[PDB]
C-alpha cells in the first residue's frame, strides 16, 4: 500500500505547473518548498482514510480489577516509552501513534464473547467517555470471567518524519495508500494549493473546479467499491428455537 | 400430450420459484455507516442517514408471483384427460 | 434390496432422504409418506 | 417428489420469516437530540425536531409478507399426493 | 402557532400492525400437528 | 485527543497565505499575531464541541438536608480555591472551569436509581432554574434515601493559558481535538479570519466560500458518524408482566 | 492487448497540437518531454483498469499452521528477490508488482470448495485487515483440510521501465490495452495536459470539454459491453431437496 | 466494402477547405500531410467498427490436452511468422492482425455443441482472463469429446501499410467500409481535425458542431438498420416435453 514520494511529486508537477510551488518561470524545476508539500500530502492521506476504511487495527488490554478508566495512548503501550507514573497494560498490537484511533468498533473477550459498545441498558455495556478511553463499570468485574480484551478500530497511518538532513533524498519517503486513492489525492492537493491565488475571471475558479472533481472521484470510488466492506450474516438458527 | 404439457408447466413453475433470490437481503450503499451497519446486523436498534427511509433502503426478497394462467392451463389439461378416459378418479383435489 | 432401502430412507428422514442445507438456513422437513401410512395402517388391519 | 417440494417450500418460508429484522427499531439521525433521545428511550413524552414527523422518522420492523403463491403450491402438491394414494387422511387442516 | 396543524404536530404512538403472515404460519403449523397426531383436541379456538 | 499548536499554524499558513496574519510580503514567515490566532482557535474548538459531543464528564455531589439550590461552579469543587463563604460540596470529578458544563444529562443516585430532569409532575423531579444550578424540592428529601448524587454532562475543554514569556515557544501548547475535527477547524478559522478583507469581485467572497465548505465538512462528519452516539435498548421485560 | 507507443504519440499529436508538449511553433515536431508524457499515460492506463476489469490474475499460497497474517507482496513471491527475513510462500502465479492487486475476489481451496470473504459469522470466513493481507483465524486450521489456496484478483498491468539510454527508441515500449480503451485514453491524456493553460474565453474550457468527452466515451463503452462480465447461474437443484 | 482513398480525400476537401490540411491559400490544392490524414482515417474506421458490427470472423483451434491458456495472437496462427518458442495451433481462419479481436462471441465444438462463455457455474464454462486468451479448465478435458474448436468474434479490418515510396499514388489504397458509414466518417474526421483551431466566436464551435452532426448521423443509421443484426428463434419444442 506504498508509493514513492518521487512519483507523487513528478505527477503533481503536471497540475501545479501554473504556480510557485514547483516551477521556476524559466526551466521549470521543483523548488524547495517540499516541506510544505509533504505537510499538505499528509493531511490529504488522513482525509482519505476518514472517507474510506482502507485499514483496521488490533490491541490487547490486560485487565486490572477495580480500575475505572483505561485510556488508549502511546504511553501505556508495550514497546513505547515507559512513563513511570503509568503501568504499561497494552501488551500487544499495532504501534500506537498520535492519530491512529479513528473509532473503536469491536470488543472481544478471551472467551469469544462480544461485548456491547455505547448501547445503554445492555447487559455488559462499555462506555467511551472521551473517544479514546474505555470506562468499565463494576458490574463488568462482577460478571466478567475474562482476564483480557481485544479491541479493533479504524486506523490511519503514521506519517514518516522528514528531517533537514533528509532533505537530500526526500524520494525514499513512502506514502501509505493504494494507487486509486492516489488518483484522488492528486485532486485534493491541487485544490488546496491552488485556492488562494489568482485574480482573473477564469483563473479565480481553479480551486473550486478541483474541489468538484475531487468529490466526483470520491463518488466514483464508492460506486466501484474499491474499499473494505464487511456484510453481516448472522446464524439465528443456533439459539435454540428457530428451527 | 396432456402428460407432457402438465409436466412442462409444473417444471416451469418450479424453475420460477427456485432460481429466484428468496432469503437474501439487500441494503443501499451509504445508508448505514460502519457502526450502524454492525448494530443492524447484530440485531439491536440503530440509526440511518437522512434521506434514505428504511422501507426503501432495505429490501428482503421473496418468492415471485405466479400468474393466473398456469393454474387455468393445468385445470384445462386435467379436465380434458378426465373427459377422454371417462374416470373421474376423485382427484385434482382432495381424494374425498 | 437397494430399491427398498431407498424407499425406506424417505418415510423416515434418514441417509439420502435428509436434505443437505447450508449453515444459517432452515433444515425442517415435513414427513408426508409416514403421514399417509399412518392413516392406512388401521383401516387395513381392522377387518381381521 | 411431492415430499421434496413441500419440504423445500416450507424451508423457504421459514428462511424468509427468520432472517428478517423483526423486533428492531430504527430512528432517523438528527430527528432527536440527546435529551429527547433519552426521554424517548426511557418511555416518557418527548419532542422532535421540525420537518421529521414520527410516522416516517421512526420505524418498527415486522415480519415480511408471504406471497399468495406458496400456499397454492403446497395445496396443489398435497392434493396430488392424496389423489395418487387414494386415502384422504382427513388432513391438510383439522383432523376433524 | 400557524403553519403547524395539530393533526401533524402532535402524535400519539400506538402498537404496530401485525402482518397477515404470522397468523397463516401458526394456523399451518397447528393444522399439520393435528393431522400428524390424529386428535383434533377441539382447540385452536374455543374449546367448544 | 491532542495536537501540537505548531502543526496547526504550519497548516493554516497554507490557507491564510493571502493576508497579514502569517506573511510578510517578502519571504513569507509567520508574524507575531499568534495571540489573536490562538484566541480564534479556542472559539473554533468550543464551536466544534457544541456541534458534536466528543466528551462527557462526571461529578459527585454530597447532599445536605434543607438545601434548596446547588450551584455547580468552580468555587465549590474540591481541590479548587476554597472561598470561605461557601462549603465545598463537590467532592469528586473532572476539574471544573468557566466553560465546562454545556448541558446536564443524567442524574444517578447512590442506589442505582435514575432521577428525572425537567420532567414536570414526575415522581422525583429535579429542576434547573439557571442552567448551572440544581433546585431540589423538599419532597426529594422526604423520599430520597440517597446521601449523594452523580451528575453527567456535556463537556468542553479548558483552553491552556498563554503567557508573554510563553511567547518563546507557543509550540508546546496542545489543542484538544481529534484530527478529523482538525480538518474542519481549519475551514472555520480561515472563514472567520478572511471575512473582513478585500474589495475585488472574486476576493470579496472567500469568507462566504469558506463558510460553505465548513458546513459541508460538518455534514460529512455527521454522515460518517465519527462522534459518540449512545443508543438505548431498554429491557421492558423485567418489570413483571411483559412475559 | 498491446500497442506501440509510436502510434500513441503520433495520434496524440493531433490533439496536443496547440501546446508546448509536442510542437515547435515552426515545423511542428515532437519535443523531448516524452518522459512526462509516459508518466501521464501510465496513470491513464491505471484509471481505465480501475473503471473496467479487462484482466484478472491468480496466485497459489502454501499454508503454514499457526500463521495469522499472510501479506501478498512481491518479496514473498517465488522468483522474486528472496528477502532473508521472509519465507517465500507464494509459489505460483502472475509476477507481482507494486500495483497488481486492485481487489481480491475469489478464494478456492485444493478440494474445490469456495471460502467466504469478509462475510462475518459465515462458517469459514477470511478477513482482509489491510486490503493486501489475509487474516486467517485458528478455527480455519481446526477445520480446514486444505494444504493450499488459490486466489483471484483484479489486475492492473505493470508499466515498462523507461531509461535514459532508452530515450533512443521509446517506440518499442508497449502499452497494455485494447484499442477501444485507446480511443478513450486519448481524451483522458488530452484533458489532463490541457487543463492548466490558456486565458481566453474559449481557450479556458478545453480541459473541461475533454473531461466531458472522456466521460461520454466511458459510458458508450459500458453500453456496448466491451469488457468482461461474468453472470452467475447457480444449480440449486443438487443440494438435495429442490426437485 | 471498399472505397478508393482518392474519392475520400476529394470529398474531405469540401469540409476541410477552411484550414491548412488541404489548401494553399492561393489555388487551393491538397498538401502533403496525407500521412496524418491517413492516420486519422484509420482511427475513424476503427471507431465505426466499434459502434456497429459490420463484420465477423472465424478461427479453428486444435486442442492439446493438459493446456490451460490459449492466447489468440498472430504468432500462433498458421501462415504467420512461426516463432520457435510457440506451437502454431490456430490452423484456419481470417489472417490475424494487431486489432482484429474486438470480442469473442460464440464457441462451437466439432460435434455441433455450443459451449458457454463467462457464464459461471454452467456445466462446461470457458473463461477469458485477459480478453484475448481462453482459459480451459481440466473438467473440460475430462468431459470434452471434442478435438477442435471454432471461434467467432467481432472484427475490425487491418489498415493497409503506407510507405514513403507509396507517396507517389496514395490513391490505390482502399478503405474498408460501406458507403453509408463513409458519409458518417466524413463528419468524424472533420470534427477531429477542426477541433484545435480558431479564436473567433463562430469559428470556435465548428468542432463541437461536427461532433453533434456525427452523433445524429450514427443515430440515423441505427434507426434505418443498415447493420447486421441476428435475432434468435429457439426451438424449445424438441427437448422432449414441450408438446
Asked if residues H154 and H55 have their Cβ atoms less than 8 Å apart, the reply is: yes
Does the beta-carbon distance from A232 to G120 stay under 8 Å?
yes
Let me know how long chain H is.
Answer: 243
Q: Which residue has the cell 480501475?
A: G50
Q: Cell numbers for H53, please give them.
A: 458490427
DSSP code of residue A161 = P
Enumerate the β-bridge partners of residue D41.
Answer: none
Label residues B32-58 b or e (16+ Cβ within 10 Å = b): bbbbbbbbbbeebbbbbbbebebeebb
Contacts of G120 in chain B (CB under 8 A): 41
HSE-up of C15 (CA within 13 Å, CB side)?
Answer: 10
Helix (H) / strand (E) element for G130: namely none
Contacts of C40 in chain E (CB under 8 A): none
CA distance D81 to chain C (A): 9
Asked if residues G116 and G63 have their Cβ atoms less than 8 Å apart, the reply is: no
With CA atoms as reference, the chain B residue closest to G242 would be B18
Q: Which residue has the cell 475533454?
A: G210
Cβ-proximal residues to G112 (8 Å cutoff; 6+ apart), any chain = none
Q: Which of B30, B37, B43 sits opposite A234 (nearest CB)?
A: B43
- DSSP count for chain D of H helices, then E strands: 4, 2
With CA atoms as reference, the chain D residue closest to B39 would be D24
Helix (H) / strand (E) element for F133: namely strand F133-135
- Chains touching chain E through at least 3 C-beta pairs below 8 angstroms are C, D
**What span, in angstroms and rounded, lies between the C-alpha atoms of B58 and B60?**
7
**What span, in angstroms and rounded, lies between the C-alpha atoms of G92 and H128?**
19
With CA atoms as reference, the chain D residue closest to A241 would be D18
Cβ-proximal residues to A139 (8 Å cutoff; 6+ apart), any chain = A124
Asked if residues G151 and G107 have their Cβ atoms less than 8 Å apart, the reply is: yes
**What span, in angstroms and rounded, lies between the C-alpha atoms of B80 and B74?**
10
Asked if residues F33 and F201 have their Cβ atoms less than 8 Å apart, the reply is: no
DSSP code of residue A19 = S
User: Mutating which of C26, C30, C33, C39 best tests the E interface, going by the most E Cβ atoms within 10 A?
Assistant: C30
Cβ-proximal residues to H174 (8 Å cutoff; 6+ apart), any chain = H2, H3, H4, H5, H160
Q: What is the largest CA-CA distance in chain E?
A: 67
**What span, in angstroms and rounded, lies between the C-alpha atoms of D69 and D66?**
8
**What span, in angstroms and rounded, lies between the C-alpha atoms of A143 and A120?**
17
Cβ-proximal residues to F224 (8 Å cutoff; 6+ apart), any chain = A50, A51, B33
**What span, in angstroms and rounded, lies between the C-alpha atoms of A183 and B86?**
78
Pairing of strands A119-120, F231-232: parallel
Let me know how long chain C is.
Answer: 48
Counting Cβ atoms within 10 Å, is residue H193 exposed (0-12), middle (13-18) or buried (19+)? buried
Residue H105 φ/ψ, nearest 5 degrees: -120, -45
Asked if residues A233 and D18 have their Cβ atoms less than 8 Å apart, the reply is: no
Q: Which of C19, C23, C24 sits opposite G241 (nearest CB)?
A: C19
Chain CA centroid to CA G160, Å:
14
Does the beta-carbon distance from D89 to C28 stay under 8 Å?
no
Residue G231 DSSP SS3: strand
With CA atoms as reference, the chain H residue closest to G228 would be H131
Helix (H) / strand (E) element for F36: namely helix F34-51
Residue G148 DSSP SS3: strand
Q: How many CB atoms lie within 10 A of CB D21?
A: 19
Residue spans of beta strands (DSSP E) within A41-183: 57-58, 61-62, 69-71, 103-109, 116-117, 119-120, 125-126, 133-135, 148-154, 174-176
Q: Cell numbers for B35, please give them.
A: 457502526
Q: How many CB atoms lie within 10 A of CB F50?
A: 12
**What span, in angstroms and rounded, lies between the C-alpha atoms of D5 and D3?**
6
Asked if residues H193 and H17 have their Cβ atoms less than 8 Å apart, the reply is: no
Asked if residues C32 and D2 have their Cβ atoms less than 8 Å apart, the reply is: yes
**What span, in angstroms and rounded, lies between the C-alpha atoms of F213 and F207?**
10
**What span, in angstroms and rounded, lies between the C-alpha atoms of G128 and A101?**
19
Enumerate the β-bridge partners of residue H120.
Answer: G232
F154 reaches D (C-beta below 8 A): yes
- DSSP count for chain F of H helices, then E strands: 5, 11
Cβ-proximal residues to H83 (8 Å cutoff; 6+ apart), any chain = H75
For helices H5-12 and H179-194, what crossing angle results, to 10°? 50
Asked if residues H192 and G14 have their Cβ atoms less than 8 Å apart, the reply is: yes
Pairing of strands G2-4, A125-126: unpaired
Does the beta-carbon distance from C19 to G239 stay under 8 Å?
yes
**What span, in angstroms and rounded, lies between the C-alpha atoms of B42 and B61?**
20
Three-state SS across chain H?
Answer: CEEEHHHHHHHHCCCCCCCCCCCCCCCCCCCCCHHHHHHHHHHHHHHHHHHCCCCCEECCEECCCCCCEEECCCCCECCCCCCCCCCCCECCCCCCCCCCCCEEEEEEECCCCECEECEECCCCEEECCCCCEEECCHHHHHCCCCCEEEEEEECCCCCCCCCCCHHHCCCCCEEECCHHHHHHHHHHHHHHHHCCCCCCCCCCCHHHHHHHHHHHHHHHHHHHCCCCCCCCCCCCCCCCCCC
- Chains touching chain C through at least 3 C-beta pairs below 8 angstroms are A, D, E, G
Cβ-proximal residues to A223 (8 Å cutoff; 6+ apart), any chain = none
For helices A5-12 and A34-51, what crossing angle results, to 10°? 100
Q: Which of residues 70-129 of A touch D (CB under 8 A)?
A: 120-121
Residue D42 DSSP SS3: helix
- Return the C-alpha torsion angle A115, A118, A122, A124, nearest 10: 40
Hey, CA dihedral for H107, H109, H114, H119, is it positive or negative? negative
Does the beta-carbon distance from G242 to D1 stay under 8 Å?
no
Q: Cell numbers for G139, please give them.
A: 478455527
Contacts of D42 in chain F (CB under 8 A): 232, 234
Enumerate the β-bridge partners of residue A176.
Answer: A2
Q: Nearest-5° angle of CA B59, CA B65, CA B66?
A: 160
Helix (H) / strand (E) element for C1: namely none
Enumerate the β-bridge partners of residue H103.
Answer: H154
Label residues H102-120 b or e (16+ Cβ within 10 Å = b): bbbeebbbeeeeebebebe
Gyration radius from chain D CA atoms = 23
Helix (H) / strand (E) element for A68: namely none
Q: How many CB atoms lie within 10 A of CB A71?
A: 13
Q: What is the resolution of this structure in A?
A: 3.1
With CA atoms as reference, the chain G residue closest to A157 would be G130
Q: Which residue has the cell 473554533?
A: F44
Q: Cell numbers for G58, please give them.
A: 491468480
Gyration radius from chain F CA atoms = 23
Enumerate the β-bridge partners of residue A71.
Answer: A133
- Looking at B1-53, list the stretches that DSSP marks H as alpha helix, in order from N- to C-terminal side: 2-18, 34-42
User: Mutating which of B7, B13, B15, B17 best tests the D interface, going by the most D Cβ atoms within 10 A?
Assistant: B17
D44 reaches F (C-beta below 8 A): yes
**What span, in angstroms and rounded, lies between the C-alpha atoms of H154 and H2?**
19
Nearest to H27 by CA among H13, H7, H38, H6: H13
Nearest to H99 by CA among H30, H176, H12, H191: H176
What does each C-alpha distance from G185 to B16, E34, G11, G191 come to in angstroms? 44, 71, 11, 10
**What span, in angstroms and rounded, lies between the C-alpha atoms of A208 and A167?**
32
Residue A71 DSSP SS3: strand
Hey, CA dihedral for G111, G114, G120, G121, is it positive or negative? negative
Cβ-proximal residues to G126 (8 Å cutoff; 6+ apart), any chain = G107, G115, G116, G117, G118, G134, G135, G136, G140
* DSSP labels, G10-73: HHHTTTSTTSTTT--SSS----S-HHHHHHHHHHHHHHHHHHS----EE--EE--TT--EEE--
Cβ-proximal residues to D6 (8 Å cutoff; 6+ apart), any chain = C30, C32, D74, D77, D78
Helix (H) / strand (E) element for G224: namely helix G206-224
Residue G120 DSSP SS3: strand
* DSSP labels, A139-154: HHHHT---SEEEEEEE
Cβ-proximal residues to B89 (8 Å cutoff; 6+ apart), any chain = B82, D83
**What span, in angstroms and rounded, lies between the C-alpha atoms of A231 and B32?**
11
**What span, in angstroms and rounded, lies between the C-alpha atoms of F164 and H52?**
78
Q: Which residue has the cell 436509581?
A: F113
**What span, in angstroms and rounded, lies between the C-alpha atoms of D31 and D51?**
9
Q: Which of A119, A154, A222 sits opposite B44 (nearest CB)?
A: A119
End-to-end CA distance of chain H, in Å? Answer: 46
Q: Which of residues 3-32 of C touch G (CB under 8 A)?
A: 16, 18-24, 29
Hey, CA dihedral for F161, F165, F167, F172, is it positive or negative? negative
Helix (H) / strand (E) element for F59: namely none
Q: Which of C20, C23, C24 sits opposite G240 (nearest CB)?
A: C20
Amino acid at each position: 500500500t506504498i508509493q514513492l514520494k518521487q512519483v507523487i511529486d513528478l505527477l503533481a508537477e503536471g497540475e501545479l505547473s501554473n504556480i510557485k510551488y514547483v516551477n521556476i518561470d524559466t526551466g521549470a524545476l521543483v523548488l524547495e518548498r517540499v516541506p510544505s508539500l509533504i505537510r499538505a500530502i499528509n493531511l490529504g492521506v488522513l482525509d482519505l482514510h476518514k472517507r474510506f476504511l482502507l485499514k483496521e487495527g488490533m490491541l490487547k488490554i490486560q485487565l486490572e480489577e477495580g480500575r475505572r478508566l483505561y485510556p488508549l495512548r502511546p504511553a501505556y503501550q508495550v514497546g513505547q516509552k515507559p512513563k513511570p507514573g503509568v503501568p504499561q497494560f497494552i501488551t500487544e498490537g499495532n504501534k500506537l501513534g498520535r492519530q491512529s484511533i479513528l473509532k473503536i468498533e469491536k470488543i472481544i473477550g478471551d472467551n469469544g464473547v462480544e461485548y456491547y459498545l455505547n448501547d445503554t441498558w445492555q447487559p455488559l455495556n462499555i462506555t467511551t467517555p472521551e473517544f479514546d478511553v474505555l470506562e468499565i463499570s463494576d458490574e463488568f468485574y462482577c460478571h466478567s470471567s475474562s482476564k483480557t480484551l481485544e479491541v479493533r478500530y479504524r486506523r490511519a497511518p503514521t506519517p514518516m518524519k522528514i528531517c533537514v538532513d533528509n532533505l537530500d533524498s526526500w524520494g525514499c519517503i513512502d506514502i501509505d495508500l493504494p494507487y486509486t486513492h492516489l488518483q484522488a489525492l492528486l485532486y485534493f492537493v491541487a485544490s488546496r494549493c491552488q485556492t488562494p491565488i489568482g485574480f482573473m475571471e477564469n483563473t479565480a475558479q481553479e480551486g473550486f473546479n478541483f474541489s468538484q472533481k475531487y468529490e466526483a472521484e470520491c463518488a466514483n470510488l464508492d460506486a466501484q467499491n474499491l474499499r473494505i466492506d464487511p456484510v453481516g450474516n448472522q446464524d439465528r438458527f443456533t439459539r435454540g428455537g428457530w428451527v | 400430450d396432456n402428460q407432457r404439457i402438465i409436466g412442462a408447466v409444473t417444471r416451469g413453475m418450479i424453475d420460477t420459484m427456485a432460481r429466484s433470490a428468496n432469503g437474501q437481503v439487500g441494503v443501499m450503499k451509504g445508508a448505514l455507516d460502519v457502526t450502524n451497519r454492525r448494530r443492524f446486523d447484530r440485531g439491536e436498534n440503530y440509526e440511518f442517514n437522512p434521506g434514505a427511509d428504511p422501507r426503501a433502503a432495505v429490501h428482503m426478497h421473496t418468492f415471485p408471483e405466479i400468474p393466473q394462467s398456469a393454474q387455468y392451463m393445468i385445470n384445462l389439461q386435467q379436465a380434458e384427460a378426465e373427459s377422454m378416459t371417462g374416470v373421474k378418479a376423485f382427484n385434482a383435489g382432495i381424494s374425498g | 434390496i437397494t430399491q427398498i432401502n431407498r424407499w425406506l430412507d424417505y418415510m423416515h428422514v434418514r441417509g439420502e432422504g435428509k436434505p443437505k442445507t447450508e449453515k444459517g438456513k432452515s433444515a425442517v422437513q415435513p414427513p408426508t409418506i409416514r403421514k399417509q401410512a399412518e392413516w392406512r395402517y388401521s383401516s387395513l388391519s381392522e377387518p381381521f
